[PDB]
C-alpha cells in the first residue's frame, strides 16, 4: 500500500545506527529511492532526549526486550540484552560514550582495504568535536557532536582519579587518539550537543527528512529478504506486526538491498531469507539460498560485573543519585533548571563516563575497562540497577549515597550465537552470548582481575577517605571461588554485540561479507552495521559502526574504493 509502484536503488532494513547514516549520503544526489524499514515507532521520546533518561529506556517499549537462552556456565540465568527499537535504534538507547578502541585492533581484523590506516580518516570525517581542535585524530566538520561530559562530581571524579594514580595508572588525556597507548584513566568523551543525545537519528536522518527521494517507514518489520535462484528482488513486511497483511516492496534493476537490523537482528532475518547454515535451516524448513557456516555465530559481547561501596555518613548527598533525586525520590528543580536552561547537571550523565583501560596481566592491549560512576548500585547486576532507579522515582524513599565500579571484558575472546527458535519471523531470535565460555577462562580472570583492582583502588587513602565498607560482593567474597561465583551470578552485558556477519578475505569459510559488505554467493545483497565487525574493538561500539556506515556510504556511491 506504502511502497506500491514503486522501485527502490536501495531498501534499508532496519533504521538504525548505521541505516540513518546510509539514509543519509545514499538520498544525497537525488537519483537514488531509498526506503528505510524501522520495526520501532518515529524518534520522539523526551527519554531519549535527556541522557539520564537511559535508566527509563531499558526494559520499555523503545526496547527490543530480548532474553538469552538459560547460560549453564552463569548459574542457569537468562541474561537481558538490551536493544533500541526505533528509528535510531541502539543510538538513540545508549549510554553516548565515544570509543574507536586502538590502531592495534583494526590491525587484527586481518581483512585487506580495512587496517587502522585505512579507517581513521573515516572516524575523523563523521565527527565535529566540541573539546578537541581539528587534527590527524579529531574532525570539526562531521554530523556527530562529541563533547566532554557537562556533569563533573567534584569530590567523587577527582577521588576516583586520584585513587587509580595512587594504585600506579598514569592518566590518558585522550582513549581516542591513536598516537599513545590506549591503557590510562580519564573521561570518556560523549556523543551530545550540549547535554541533549547526539544519537545518529538526531544527527544523520532527522535533517535529511524532506527528500523526496527518501521514504522511511516506522512500525514496519520486515518478515524476510526475496531472494530468487541469486538475486535480491527486495523485501517482505508488516505495516501491523504479526497479525498485520504481508505488504512487499521490490528493487530497480542494479538495486541493493543492505541489511541495517544490527547484530542480533540481521543475522535472525538472513536465516528467515534462506542465507545461513543449511542444517539449522532444514531444521525449520526453510529453503537455503546460500549455505554461510558463519551466520549468527562469532557474537562478541564484552561483559561486566560491578564493585560498590556507600559514603561515610559525613558525605550523605555528594552522589549523582542525590544530585537527581532528593529524599522522597522526586526529581530535583535545581537538575531539571541547570539542565533545561544551561545543559548542565546531573540530568546531561548516563552515569559511567569516566574510568580506566587496564592491562590486567601484560597483555598487548588492555583487556579491562573500568566504568566509574559516582552513585552506588542497589543490585550487582548494573543494567537491573538502571532500572530499578527508573522505578525508584517518587517512593518516597532516600537512594543512599556510595560509588560503583564496573568491570569490562573489553576485548572478551568468549563468543555466542543468534539461530531460530521457530520459524515465525516475529518471534525472539535464539540469542545466546557464551560469556565464560573461551577455553583458557582468559575472560573470567580478566572479570575476577578486575574486582582484585577494583577493591585496591576503593582501599587507596584517595578513595578510603570517603567509603565505609562495600556492599557488592561484600565482606563474605574473599577467595578466588566466591569472586568467581559472584561474577558467574552478576555478570551482565556493557551493551556492545558485534561479529554475527562477519567479513573476511577471499577463501575464509567463516566470513559472510566480502571487504565490499557484499552476503557471499548473492547479488544485491550487503550487510552495514556491527553484524560486520571481525574481532570487538576495545570500548563501546557505537562510533566504529559510524566508521562503517560512512566508508559503506562512500563505496556505494563511488566516492572511494576499497583494496
Ligand atoms: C543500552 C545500550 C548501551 C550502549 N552504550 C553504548 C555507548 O555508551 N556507546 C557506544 O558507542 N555504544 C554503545 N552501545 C552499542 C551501540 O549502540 C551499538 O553497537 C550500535 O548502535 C549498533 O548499531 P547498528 O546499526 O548495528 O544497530 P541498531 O542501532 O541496534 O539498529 C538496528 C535497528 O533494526 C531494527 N530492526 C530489527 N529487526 C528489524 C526488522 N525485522 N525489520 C525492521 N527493523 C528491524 C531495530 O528496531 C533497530 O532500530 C550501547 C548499546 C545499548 C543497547
Ligand atoms: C532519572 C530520570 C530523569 C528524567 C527527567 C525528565 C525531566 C522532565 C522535564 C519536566
Ligand atoms: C544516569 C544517572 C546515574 C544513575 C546510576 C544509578 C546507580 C549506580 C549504578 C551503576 C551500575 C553500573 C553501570 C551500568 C551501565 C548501564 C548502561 C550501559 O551499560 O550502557
Known amino acids: 500500500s506504502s511502497p506500491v509502484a514503486q522501485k527502490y ?91 574507536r578502541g586502538a590502531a592495534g585492533d583494526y590491525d587484527a581484523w586481518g581483512v585487506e582495504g580495512w587496517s587502522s590506516e585505512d579507517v581513521l580518516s573515516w572516524f575523523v570525517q563523521a565527527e565535529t568535536n566540541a573539546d578537541f581542535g581539528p587534527g590527524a585524530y579529531h574532525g570539526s566538520g562531521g554530523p556527530m557532536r562529541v563533547e566532554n561530559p557537562r556533569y563533573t562530581n567534584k569530590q567523587l571524579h577527582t577521588a576516583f582519579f586520584k585513587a587509580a594514580e595512587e594504585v600506579g595508572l598514569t592518566p590518558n588525556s585522550d582513549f581516542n587518539d591513536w598516537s599513545h597507548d590506549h591503557a590510562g ?54 505495516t501491523d506486526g504479526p497479525t ?43 529453503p537455503v539460498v546460500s549455505n554461510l ?19 561515610k555518613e559525613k558525605y550523605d548527598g555528594i552522589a549523582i543519585s542525590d544530585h537527581i533525586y532528593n529524599e522522597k525520590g522526586q526529581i530535583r528543580k535545581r537538575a531539571i533548571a541547570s539542565y533545561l536552561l ?7 550523565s548516563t552515569g559511567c563516563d569516566r574510568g580506566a583501560f587496564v592491562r590486567t596481566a601484560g597483555q598487548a592491549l588492555p583487556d579491562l575497562q573500568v566504568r566509574f560512576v559516582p552513585g552506588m548500585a542497589l543490585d550487582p547486576d548494573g543494567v537491573s540497577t538502571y532500572v530499578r532507579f527508573a522505578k525508584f522515582q517518587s517512593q518516597g524513599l532516600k537512594w543512599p549515597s556510595g560509588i560503583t565500579m564496573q568491570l569490562i571484558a573489553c576485548r572478551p575472546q568468549s563468543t555466542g550465537s543468534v539461530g531460530l ?38 582501599r587507596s587513602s584517595a578513595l578510603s577517605e570517603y567509603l565505609d565498607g562495600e556492599l557488592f560482593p561484600g565482606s563474605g567474597v574473599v577467595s578466588d571461588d566466591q569472586i568467581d561465583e559472584y561474577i558467574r551470578r552478576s555478570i551482565h552485558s556493557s551493551n556492545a554485540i558485534t561479529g554475527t556477519c562477519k567479513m573476511g578475505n577471499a577463501g575464509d569459510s567463516s566470513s559472510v561479507v566480502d571487504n565490499q559488505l557484499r552476503v557471499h554467493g548473492v547479488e544485491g545483497l550487503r550487510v552495514v552495521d556491527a553484524s560486520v565487525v571481525p574481532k570487538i574493538p576495545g570500548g563501546q561500539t557505537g562510533a566504529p559502526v559510524v566508521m562503517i556506515a560512512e566508508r559503506a556510504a562512500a563505496l556505494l556511491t563511488g566516492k572511494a574504493t576499497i583494496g
Not at 547484530?263 to 524448513?285: D, I, Q, R, Y
Not at 544551561?342 to 546531561?348: D, P, S
Open 9 to 99: 536503488d536501495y531498501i534499508l532494513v532496519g533504521g538504525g545506527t548505521a541505516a540513518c547514516v546510509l539514509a543519509n549520503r545514499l538520498s544525497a544526489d537525488g537519483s537514488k529511492r531509498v526506503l528505510v524499514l524501522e520495526a520501532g515507532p518515529d524518534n520522539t521520546s523526551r527519554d531519549v532526549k535527556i541522557p539520564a533518561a537511559i535508566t527509563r529506556l531499558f526494559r520499555s517499549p523503545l526496547d527490543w526486550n530480548l532474553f538469552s537462552e538459560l547460560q549453564e556456565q552463569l548459574a542457569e540465568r537468562q541474561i537481558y540484552m538490551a536493544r533500541g527499537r526505533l528509528l535510531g535504534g541502539s543510538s538513540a538507547t545508549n549510554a553516548t560514550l565515544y570509543h
Open 421 to 458: 527458535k521457530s520459524a515465525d519471523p516475529f518471534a525472539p531470535p535464539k540469542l545466546s552470548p557464551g560469556y565464560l565460555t573461551d577455553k583458557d577462562g582468559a575472560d573470567l580472570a580478566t572479570l575476577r582481575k578486575g574486582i582484585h583492582w577494583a577493591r585496591d583502588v576503593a
Open 185 to 238: 584513566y580519564g573521561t570518556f568523551q560523549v556523543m551530545q550537543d550540549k547535554g541533549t543525545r547526539a544519537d545518529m537519528y538526531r544527527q544523520y536522518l532527522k535533517p535529511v527528512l524532506g527528500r523526496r527521494n527518501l521514504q522511511v517507514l516506522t512500525g514496519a518489520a520486515v518478515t524476510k529478504v526475496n531472494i530468487d535462484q541469486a538475486q535480491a528482488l527486495g523485501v517482505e513486511f508488516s
Open 244 to 286: 498485520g497483511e504481508r505488504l512487499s516492496a521490490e528493487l530497480a534493476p542494479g538495486g541493493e538491498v543492505i541489511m541495517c537490523a544490527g547484530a542480533v537482528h540481521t543475522p535472525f532475518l538472513l536465516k528467515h531469507s534462506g542465507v545461513g547454515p543449511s542444517a539449522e535451516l532444514k531444521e525449520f524448513g526453510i
Open 293 to 311: 557456516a558463519g551466520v549468527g555465530q562469532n557474537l562478541q559481547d564484552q561483559p561486566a560485573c560491578l564493585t560498590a561501596a556507600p559514603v
Open 342 to 348: 544551561g545543559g548542565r547537571g546531573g540530568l546531561t
